[PDB]
């Protein structure tokens, strides 16, 4: 078959590779934005879903990454173990992923004292898959397998069909609604700044919806820099860093972790989470040619990508046997 | 009184400051080596004692540091939280410091799989007090209080006495045996290399005495670099980096953590742990003038320093009331 994948973020590339592996075929990746200009490049890269099928896709992804975490290749993947805190106010039940992450537990009283404003929470060990390095890795692997890349903006699936493609794999993310309307797909705008604070060895996530849910400070160490954030604005399309939000993050994070006050700011990026009540991963026969939708991963695309890639490949198989 | 402290490592400076605070006096620090040329500068700086009174001195130190850990000043102290692994073979009982460290526990099966060679171990959250930055901090504080510093090599306590000093506080560390013989004081030579591997967010200590006890690999992340080590050579006085030991560390640590293979080596230092069956913290009236010995902290001087400083100050009081 003649395959075309639309999208060169984590979903698009993970899918293309994951299919190429199951079945070997002419695979072409089309996207209007490649690294470091994708939403994937913005993300801190913490494995952790938000609060039915999806749990297994996440859990598949975790184990897959956990396999690679202690091999020499991991540096090029931008993958590493990291333990950290989740902070709430009222106590709430353990997550679905309790047993998926390494060494999950409830915070002791002594730990909770370190965060004056929060009274209940977790500690666990997870991973970070840094978007930048993962896409370079996925791209180097796809290129090794003769998967050709072209930079171009697709105006319709029909456009791609006329070219002579048997299967279209649509991993356009938040921009999907252009190619086929979907009012369930809303952009959940977020903004982060990358600061220099190497003493930070743990991630810290908070859960305070006073500003609208997910407008609450978080600190997520990376390799070179530390990601500061906590902005989630449904409906905002402004791909522009914003001063009001810049301060909101800075203030929020400084209160959590005062040591951060004298940390040099290295950068700041805006990106859009492709939010949808559930992910859209399903087959579809085009009006005028098969389509696999794989978009709407919200704020957990790196967390869940690999499970989605396999499920897309198993969908790609289901079509090849027709 | 006219006070003189001998030593400008963690013990010497912590003691001088800790006394200046309890009682306010003319305090002078004498030492032949100041930063970054002290044994204190070599140490990774992990809080963790080795395996009766001493437990409380350690525990005093921990809490004292834990107070400072979330204040803005901490960066200048070189102090930060860090979680990590201790790896053994045969299972052994929990340590005295179980309840002192944050969130102590036994490793789950799934965690133990990440270290093929080890079958039992711990996980806990501790701190790192980086020797370099702590001494700059202690020195800036002591200077703020008009504590004058002089670089000079003391040949005898009698030498210092004739100058006209009422109390001598001897924090000479491993070189103490020159000023007063002590065959219980042996140098426990160690060597470490500082590599560049920022993805390392946890410390890892191992316990395999095949090469003599404490000749076993360890990885201890710092702020800017990661400390690699595991050398403990009783009786060796060679202040010289050694190629056989350089490789031993490199090999040992690479087996624990393969990701480390392609990590650029930033530096390498040799230092001597002042080993003694127990610490020598006690008062003594000189032959020809009072002395407080405070030396022999082995591989846990940063871990225990503050408890030792307070106990030395309480000893300094006991003398002032005479
Ligand atoms: C600020 C922020 C922080 C985040 N942090 C985390 C985190 O810590 N952990 C986590 O798991 N997730 C996180 N996420 C979520 C994660 O970043 C996204 O879910 C993920 O990057 C989406 O992957 P994607 O491939 O669907 O989208 P994208 O990475 O946006 O890729 C979309 C691709 O499709 C292409 N494309 C789209 N439309 C067209 C078209 N019409 N024609 C041609 N090409 C097209 C684009 O050029 C691009 O190549 C975060 C998101 C944001 C915004
Ligand atoms: C390789 C290595 C790694 C380590 N890692 C850790 C760790 O992770 N955590 C931890 O808690 N501990 C660690 N330690 C232990 C710690 O480094 C020491 O216990 C501690 O630094 C000793 O402090 P000190 O002030 O006694 O000695 P030093 O720091 O050696 O200071 C001694 C001072 O006395 C002066 N002096 C000595 N004799 C004389 C004299 N005759 N005249 C004038 N001045 C004199 C010296 O100039 C110097 O200023 C480590 C040690 C080594 C060697
Ligand atoms: O999506 C992101 O911006 C970061 C990744 C991430 C975030 C959460 C958040 C969250 C979001 C915004 C502000 C505060 C907390 C809550 C949550 O429950 O899960 C998350 C998982 C993630 O991977
Ligand atoms: O003293 C040092 O060199 C590091 C600090 C340190 C080490 C231990 C070690 C050790 C020592 C050498 C090789 C492997 C393990 C064993 C141990 O049980 O406790 C330690 C505490 C420390 O602060
Ligand atoms: Na609290
Ligand atoms: Na094991």
Binding-site residues of A sit at: 8-11, 32-33, 38-40, 44-46, 48, 153-154, 172, 214, 218, 273, 298-299, 301-303
How far apart are alpha carbons B308 and B277 in whole angstroms? 16
Task: Tell me if chain B has a CB within 8 Å of the CB of A261.
Answer: yes
| Strand-pair partners of B30 | B6, B150
Q: How many CA atoms lie within 13 A of A310 on its CB side?
A: 12
Is the CB of A191 inside a 6 Å radius of any atom of ligand 3? no
Q: Show the beta-strand stretches assigned E in chain A.
A: 2-6, 26-31, 79-88, 102-106, 120-129, 148-151, 167-170, 186-196, 203-206, 218-221, 226-229, 233-234, 264-275, 280-285, 290-295
CB contact under 8 A, B110 and A125: no
| Strand-pair partners of B135 | none
DSSP A168: E
User: Which atom from ligand 2 is nearest to the alpha carbon of B31?
Assistant: 44
How far apart are alpha carbons A103 and A81 in whole angstroms? 12
Q: Which of B198, B273, B279 is nearest to B236 (CA)?
A: B273
Resolution value in angstroms: 2.8
In A89-198, which residue ranges form alpha helices assigned H by DSSP?
109-112, 131-144, 157-164, 176-179
Q: Which of A272, A266, A265, A216 is nearest to A239 (CA)?
A: A272
How far apart are alpha carbons A65 and A102 in whole angstroms? 13
Interval between CA B120 and ligand 6 midpoint (Å): 8
Task: Tell me if chain B has a CB within 8 Å of the CB of A74.
Answer: yes
| Ligand in nearest proximity to the CA of A110 | 5
CB contact under 8 A, B201 and A257: no
How far apart are alpha carbons A120 and A118 in whole angstroms? 6
Check the CA dihedral B162-B167-B171-B176 and report its sign: positive
CB proximity under 8 Å: A 177-236 to B: 198-202, 221, 223-224
Task: Tell me if chain B has a CB within 8 Å of the CB of A168.
Answer: no
B153 is in an annotated binding site: yes
- Structure method: X-ray
Is the Cβ–Cβ distance between A274 and A187 less than 8 Å? Answer: yes
Taking the CA of residue B107 and the nearest CA in chain A, the distance in Å comes to 8
CB proximity under 8 Å: B 123-162 to A: 123, 125
How far apart are alpha carbons B255 and B268 in whole angstroms? 20
Taking the CA of residue A159 and the nearest CA in chain B, the distance in Å comes to 43
Task: List CB contacts (< 8 A) between B69 and chain A.
Answer: 114, 259
Cβ-Cβ contacts under 8 Å for A22 (sequence gap 6 or more): A313, A314, A316, A317
- For B254, phi and psi rounded to 5 degrees? -60, -30
A contact test, residue of B71, B77, B108, B201 with most A CBs within 10 A: B201
The pair of three-digit structure tokens given for residue B149, joined into one six-digit string: 């510093």
Q: For residue A49, is the peptide bond before it cis, meaning its omega torsion is within 30 degrees of 0?
A: no
Find, in chain A, the residue whose alpha carbon is nearest to that of B76.
Answer: A259
CB contact under 8 A, A221 and B202: no
Check the CA dihedral B295-B298-B304-B306 and report its sign: positive
Show the domains of chain B with their CATH numbers: 1-78+130-185+276-322 (3.40.50.720), 79-129+186-275 (3.30.9.10)
Q: For residue B36, is the peptide bond before it cis, meaning its omega torsion is within 30 degrees of 0?
A: yes
């Amino acid at each position: 078959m003649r395959v075309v994948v639309i999208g060169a973020g984590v979903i698009g590339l993970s899918t293309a590779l994951c299919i190429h592996e199951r079945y070997h075929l002419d695979i072409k990746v089309y996207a209007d934005r490649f690294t470091p200009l994708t939403t994937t490049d913005v993300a801190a890269g913490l494995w952790q879903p938000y609060l039915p099928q999806e749990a297994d896709w996440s859990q598949q992804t975790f184990d897959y990454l956990l396999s690679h975490v202690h091999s020499p290749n991991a540096e090029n993947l931008g993958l590493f173990l990291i333990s950290g805190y989740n902070l709430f106010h009222e106590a709430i039940p353990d997550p679905s992923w309790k047993d998926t992450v390494l060494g999950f537990r409830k915070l002791t009283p002594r730990e909770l004292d370190m965060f004056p404003d929060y009274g209940y929470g977790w500690f666990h060990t997870s991973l970070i898959l840094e978007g930048k390095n993962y896409l370079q890795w996925l791209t180097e692997r796809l290129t090794e397998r003769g998967v050709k890349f072209f930079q171009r903006k697709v105006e319709s699936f029909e456009e791609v069909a006329r070219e002579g493609a048997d299967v279209i794999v649509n991993c356009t993310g938040v921009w999907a609604g252009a190619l086929q309307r979907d009012p369930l797909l809303q952009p959940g705008r977020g903004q982060i700044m990358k600061v220099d604070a190497p003493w930070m060895k743990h991630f810290i996530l908070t859960h305070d919806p006073e500003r609208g849910i997910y407008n609450s400070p978080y600190i997520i160490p990376g390799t070179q820099t530390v990601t500061l954030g906590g902005i989630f604005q449904l409906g905002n399309w402004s791909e522009l860093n914003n001063i009001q939000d810049h301060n909101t993050i800075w203030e929020g994070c400084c209160r959590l972790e005062p040591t951060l006050k004298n940390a040099r700011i290295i950068g700041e990026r805006t990106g859009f989470r492709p939010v949808r009540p559930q992910i859209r991963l399903e087959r579809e026969q085009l009006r005028t040619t098969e389509v696999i939708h794989n978009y709407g991963h919200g704020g957990y695309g790196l967390t869940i990508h690999w499970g989605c890639a396999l499920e897309a490949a198993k969908l790609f198989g289901r079509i090849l046997e027709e």
